[PDB]
Amino acid sequence: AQRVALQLVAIVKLTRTALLYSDPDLRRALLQDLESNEGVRVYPREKTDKFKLQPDESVNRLIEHDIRSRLGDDTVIAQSVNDIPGVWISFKIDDDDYWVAL
């Protein structure tokens, strides 16, 4: 479970890092690159964005525990956000909230 969690954590931290250090006028272009070339979709997260948990199947809960241990206990991990299926993990830059969908 640690093995899957660590890959997901790496993807999220690298994506966050890319956003964090981005040239402000290349920011939207970066998002296009991440989605098209890396299959990583980043969205701003709104407080009102609804989400559904991953099922308690196999080792899902342990993966989730491991991810929060690295990214923070407030991290949301979901199988859908606003009705859109995926692997969804929240992250923050300062007071701004985001999703990564894989």
Tell me which residues touch a second copy (CB under 8 A). 7, 10-11, 13-15, 17-18, 20-24, 26-27, 29-30, 33-34, 37-38, 40
In the complex, minimum distance from the CB of residue 31 to a second copy, in angstroms, rounded to a whole number: 9
Amino acid at residue number 29: A
What's 55's DSSP letter?
P
Diameter of the chain measured on Cα atoms: 43
Supply the minimum distance, in Å, between the C-beta of residue 28 and a second copy: 10
**What's the rounded Cα separation, in Å, for the pair 47 and 96?**
11
Measured from the CB atom, is 43 or 51 closer to a second copy?
Answer: 43
